[PDB]
C-alpha cells in the first residue's frame, strides 16, 4: 500500500478527543484529517476508528483504536482487500493498575469506607473483613497484554499467580499455565479470578453457573475483558446465593449497564464504566501504533496487530 | 527479670477481639489473663495494652500493641523502672497495601466510580482525569516499617521513589533519601506525599500551609501516621483553595473524625477510620512479638522494640 492520508473517524471521541489525536500525528508525513459519519474513502486512505463503517471498505487500511475487534466484520475486510489492525499491546499498564486497584480495594475494604464517607460514619470493619493480597491466589484467564499487566503487578504484590491461555505456553510470573479445557482446575482455589480474554466463539459464556459453583465462596470475579464472556444473569444469581463473594466489573453484556441491573446494588460489586484502560495519554499511545505501521507500510514490512 | 504472668488489658479490644489474642498466646508458658480497667499489678507482671494506665507502673514490663506509643508517658516509665515495648515491625504489608490502594484509587478514579455506583450512573471520567502510577513520583516521609512497606510497593508499580527520614541513611528502593530539614525539596515534585512518621516533638505540625504551598497542585497527601503530623485546618484550607488536589487520610487530630469536618465532603479525599493496618490476623502478628520478648526476657537478651 501507498498511504496518502489518515482519516480520523469521529467515533474515536468515545475514547479520546479527536483533535488531540490528530495533533499527536502532525509530523506523520501524511495529512491527518477529521472524518465525519458520512465521509467517503478511497485508494490511499487509512482510517482510525472505534467501530466499523461499511464506507471504510473503500479504504486501504483501517486501524481499530480498541484491542477488542469482535464488533468488526473480519471476513468482509478480507473479501474487500482492506487491511484491519487493532490496538492490542497498549493497555497493560492501565488495566494492570486498575485490576491491582480492584483487588486492593477488596482486601483493604476501601469501597466500604467510601460508602461510609457519604454517611460521615466512622464504621469499623468486622474483624474478619480486612486481609492482605500478599499470599493470596489469583487466576488470570487470558495471558496477553491485559493478563500480563495484571500478572506482573499481582506477583510483585506477593500473590500466588496461576492462569489460562489458548496455547498453554509458559508466561513469566505465572506458576502454572492451564489450557482452556482446564478452567475449573485453574479457578478452583483462587481468591480472585480475572478475565482478560477476547470475546470469541470459545470464550462467549465461558463463565457461568458451573464456574461460580467451582469458585471459592470467598472469591471475587474481575471482568475487564468483554461482558458476554460471563453469563451475566448467572453472575447475579451467584452473588445473590453466595456462590462467590463479589466482583469488580468494567464490562457488561449491555453497555451502558442498565439502571435496573441488580449488579449496581451489591456492596461487594465494583462497577466501572468500561474505563479500566482509560488514560489521559491514550491519544499518544494509539498514535505510536499508527506511526509504527505507517513506517512498516513505507518499508514493506508486515503490519503490527494485523487481524486480516 | 522473672515474668510470672501476662495480663491482657481490656483496651486491646480496640484493635482485636481479646479472646483471639489470649488463645493465640496459649503456648506462652506463663499464664495469660484478661485484665479489666481497675486491675492492680506487681512484680513479675507483664502487661499487653492499647493505651496507658498508671496501674502498669507497678508491673515489670508493658507491651503496647500499637506501633505508635505517643500516648504513653515514656519518661515516667523510665523513672518507675518499668520496661516499655511497642509493636513496630508488623504493619508493613497491611499499610503498604492500603497506601498502594489509595494511590491506585486516585490514578484509576475508582472512588469517583464508586460514588456513581450509588446513583446507578454510568459516568465517564473527564479525559484528563485517569492516569497511571507508573512513572509518577512519590515522596515517603518516614522510612521505617510503614514507609518501607509503601516504598517497596510503589517501586514495584514503577513509581519514582524519594523519601525523608531522621538519619538520612540509605533505604532500598529509595532513589534519594533526604533529612527532615530538606522536606520542601523532597515534596516539591511529588505526585504523592505519604506520611509514615511517629508523632514526636519534631513531627507535630510538620505538614502545614507552607508545605501545601510547596506541593504540586495536582498532588495528593496520604496520612497513615498520626493526625497531628498535619495541621488539619491548613489541610482543609489547602483543599478548598486547590493548593493540593486531594488526600487519603486514615488518621485525624480527633478520632472519630467529627461528622461536621469538611474533610468528609471533598470528592478527592478518602476517609478511612484508622484501619490502614487492619488485618484478620492481627492477634497472631502481635502474639509473635510477645512470644519473642518473653523468651528474650527469660534469657537476659535485648528486647525487641524497647522504647524505655
Ligand atoms: N477497557 C477494557 O475493559 C479493555 C481494554 C483492552 C482490551 N479489552 C479486552 O481484552 C481482550 C484482550 O486484550 P489483550 O490486548 O490482552 O489481547 P491479547 O494480547 O491478544 O491476549 C489475549 C489472550 O487471551 C488468550 N485467550 C484466547 N482465547 C482464550 C480462551 N478461550 N481461554 C483463555 N485464554 C484465551 C490468548 O491466548 P494465547 O496467548 O495462548 O493465544 C492471549 O493470552 C480484548 O480482546 C478486549 O476484548 C478490554
Ligand atoms: N493504623 C495506622 O494508621 C498506623 C499503624 C502503624 C503505625 N502508625 C503510625 O506510624 C508511625 C510509624 O510506624 P513505623 O512502624 O513505620 O515506625 P518505625 O519503623 O520506627 O519508623 C519511623 C520512621 O520515621 C522516621 N522519622 C522520625 N522522625 C522523622 C522526621 N521528623 N521526619 C521524617 N522522618 C522521621 C524514622 O527515621 P529514622 O529511621 O531515620 O530514625 C523512621 O524511618 C507510628 O509511630 C504510628 O504513629 C499508624
Ligand atoms: Mg459492612
Ligand atoms: Mg495475605
Ligand atoms: Mg496472540
Ligand atoms: Mg507454565
Ligand atoms: Mg513479561
Ligand atoms: Mg462457589
Ligand atoms: Mg463444582
Ligand atoms: Mg442501588
Ligand atoms: Mg503514568
Ligand atoms: Mg528506628
Ligand atoms: Mg548517622
Ligand atoms: Mg527492604
Ligand atoms: Mg535494590
Ligand atoms: Mg515543629
Ligand atoms: Mg524542626
Ligand atoms: Mg514547615
Ligand atoms: Mg501547592
Ligand atoms: Mg480538584
Ligand atoms: Mg458529605
Ligand atoms: Mg460526586
Ligand atoms: Mg544497644
Numbering used by the authors:
A (entry chain B), B (entry chain A): 1 to 308
Which text from the study accompanies this structure?
Interestingly, the structures of the D2HDH complexes determined in this study have shown that, dependent upon the crystallisation conditions used, the 2-ketoacid substrate can be trapped in the crystal structure in two different orientations, representing a catalytic or abortive mode of binding. In both the productive and abortive modes of substrate binding the 2-ketohexanoic acid alkyl side chain occupies a similar position in the active site, but is twisted as a result of a 120° rotation to the C2-C3 torsion angle.
